Amino acid sequence: SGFRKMAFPSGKVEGCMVQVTCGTTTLNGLWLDDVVYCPRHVICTSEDMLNPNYEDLLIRKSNHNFLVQAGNVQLRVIGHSMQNCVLKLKVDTANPKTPKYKFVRIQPGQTFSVLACYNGSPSGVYQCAMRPNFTIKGSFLNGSCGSVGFNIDYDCVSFCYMHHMVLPTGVHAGTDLEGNFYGPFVDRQTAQAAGTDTTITVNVLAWLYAAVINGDRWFLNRFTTTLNDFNLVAMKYNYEPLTQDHVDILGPLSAQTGIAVLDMCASLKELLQNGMNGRTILGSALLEDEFTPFDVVRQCSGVTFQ
Amino acid sequence: SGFRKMAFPSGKVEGCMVQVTCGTTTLNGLWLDDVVYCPRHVICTSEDMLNPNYEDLLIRKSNHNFLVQAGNVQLRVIGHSMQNCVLKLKVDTANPKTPKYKFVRIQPGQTFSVLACYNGSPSGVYQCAMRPNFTIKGSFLNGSCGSVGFNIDYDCVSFCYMHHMVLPTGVHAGTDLEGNFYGPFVDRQTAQAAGTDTTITVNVLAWLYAAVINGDRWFLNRFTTTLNDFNLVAMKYNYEPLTQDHVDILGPLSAQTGIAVLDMCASLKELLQNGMNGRTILGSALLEDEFTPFDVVRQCSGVTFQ
Ligand SMILES: *C(=N)[C@H](C[C@@H]1CCNC1=O)NC(=O)[C@@H]1[C@@H]2[C@H](CN1C(=O)[C@@H](NC(=O)C(F)(F)F)C(C)(C)C)C2(C)C
Numbered sequence A, B: 001s002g003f004r005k006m007a008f009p010s011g012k013v014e015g016c017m018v019q020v021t022c023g024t025t026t027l028n029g030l031w032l033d034d035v036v037y038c039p040r041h042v043i044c045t046s047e048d049m050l051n052p053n054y055e056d057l058l059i060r061k062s063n064h065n066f067l068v069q070a071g072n073v074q075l076r077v078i079g080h081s082m083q084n085c086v087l088k089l090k091v092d093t094a095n096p097k098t099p100k101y102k103f104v105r106i107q108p109g110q111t112f113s114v115l116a117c118y119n120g121s122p123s124g125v126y127q128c129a130m131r132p133n134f135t136i137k138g139s140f141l142n143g144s145c146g147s148v149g150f151n152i153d154y155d156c157v158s159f160c161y162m163h164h165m166v167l168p169t170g171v172h173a174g175t176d177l178e179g180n181f182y183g184p185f186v187d188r189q190t191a192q193a194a195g196t197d198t199t200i201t202v203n204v205l206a207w208l209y210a211a212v213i214n215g216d217r218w219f220l221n222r223f224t225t226t227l228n229d230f231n232l233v234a235m236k237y238n239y240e241p242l243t244q245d246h247v248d249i250l251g252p253l254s255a256q257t258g259i260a261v262l263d264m265c266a267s268l269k270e271l272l273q274n275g276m277n278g279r280t281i282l283g284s285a286l287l288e289d290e291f292t293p294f295d296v297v298r299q300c301s302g303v304t305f306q
């Protein structure tokens, strides 16, 4: 009953959050086993960030220059290295709350939960999508850098995002946990803009299935369409092409509701060409594209985590 | 940068979730110190729930009939009692993860986070409002009963909601942690309907302030209004009357933005009488009323929890 944007329970990630200070710059770090991961611009003054030479700034630092605080306990730093745009601080204490984890690089269209943190302390959790233009539509203030995005599978936390910056129009950019940015962005205070974004078609279809599962059914028309003809229409309205892989991923929802993916594509085609005429779907006046097919299954089938 | 529905970090509550089974009925319980709290209808068969006599059903149970599982560990039950619609199971082990906590009864219009659980295990977290008709618009499946709603203040978890049932139109109903239902509902499978709902006016105003803080400003008109005249208009569109207490609670946002509450009331009055003309506010095509003034401050000022 009901369908909501829903984040993963954050407790496993909360126990990994620490504060990292270098000089007068403080941000969040992620403490897994005996390594703390954080954005490399913790080593920058405000003036360094206009055109930093990270390798140069880092050669002038030593272990003791990094103040790492887990709550009210300082963690002694015994090694450091730079991996792409991420700094790795080796500490002399393994985090006893470390969950089973992986580092993954997610694909555009996939969703994850963000645990927004300041000074190493969690402020809130929300659900995000990696946009096709490799930005995310988050909520972040000064000092949020080093907040992470993650998915959970039973007992395993898959970390996929570390926050670094905000761009014009207010969208956010960051890296995977190997320090590689999503998209063409750089961690420098210089002129940068996101490319034009597009609508994640497979996710809109997943969300229409969620609507049907939840009894919100007015938009279902009596028609079908071809994959080729749907994608012709989708292009006009700035929607990602639907691939056969996407059709296959939608199969569980298609089987659950008895609606073929291409039949649902016919209904979405009408909605795009005609609008929603002041009606809502699942309480929303716009078509929603930040639920994956898995998100829909997970929420409508009550999948839990251990 | 950005404004999102954002839940409290759930870790403190995750460490209190347990599974409670009686007979063949299983649901979630909340384990604080040496007491487990859960909905009393765990003692009902499917047929009992049509017209249960809870006192009668409970007199036929003894301590050993209650199977309480915290992960893979069974907690021995050494006492039980019924308090309104909640069952309290005394166990022989205090929960070592118990946070500092309070039980509170929230008022209509206030928000909280729900940790949706199945079989004692957390599935996800989302933000909810107590509606003026004493329902909540949640996302709950079979077996979710005993999931709780809560707010966090620094280190203190204020539990305010325990989930019990879903009503026609798909809205949900439940109790505070003393077992008293919000609204006129009863924990019986019988014909029940929510009253007509209304829009939480103070929260819409808080959300308009969030829009201004985030630079989304088109709806601001050049006018002002009286409290009396605004509420005349608000009545027509099924909005709660705005009280002076509400004006005072909005003062921090009014001071932050330089916009008097009654000036913002003039802008909201235009939006109601005129619509949004296909425009969005903070990405939304409808006026949003599930952010409190505190929610707005907390998200735009980065308040954290310890
Ligand atoms: C980390 N704590 C912050 C998070 C930012 C701050 C406000 N909202 C956020 O998401 N990260 C930064 O301040 C980064 C950081 C230098 C500058 N920066 C920016 O986000 C800047 N953005 C850009 O220069 C642009 F447009 F290219 F993205 C700023 C103008 C301050 C918003 C570094 C090392 C990139």
Ligand SMILES: *C(=N)[C@H](C[C@@H]1CCNC1=O)NC(=O)[C@@H]1[C@@H]2[C@H](CN1C(=O)[C@@H](NC(=O)C(F)(F)F)C(C)(C)C)C2(C)C
Pocket (backbone or CB within 6 Å): A001, B027, B041, B049, B140, B141, B142, B143, B144, B145, B146, B163, B164, B165, B166, B167, B168, B172, B186, B187, B188, B189, B190, B191, B192
């Ligand atoms: C607890 N696990 C469930 C949560 C429900 C189940 C589906 N979505 C939810 O939120 N609670 C119940 O099944 C409760 C419970 C008996 C019956 N019940 C209902 O929710 C029923 N609702 C009503 O009878 C109504 F309309 F009055 F609210 C049901 C028809 C099964 C949806 C008790 C003890 C009230």
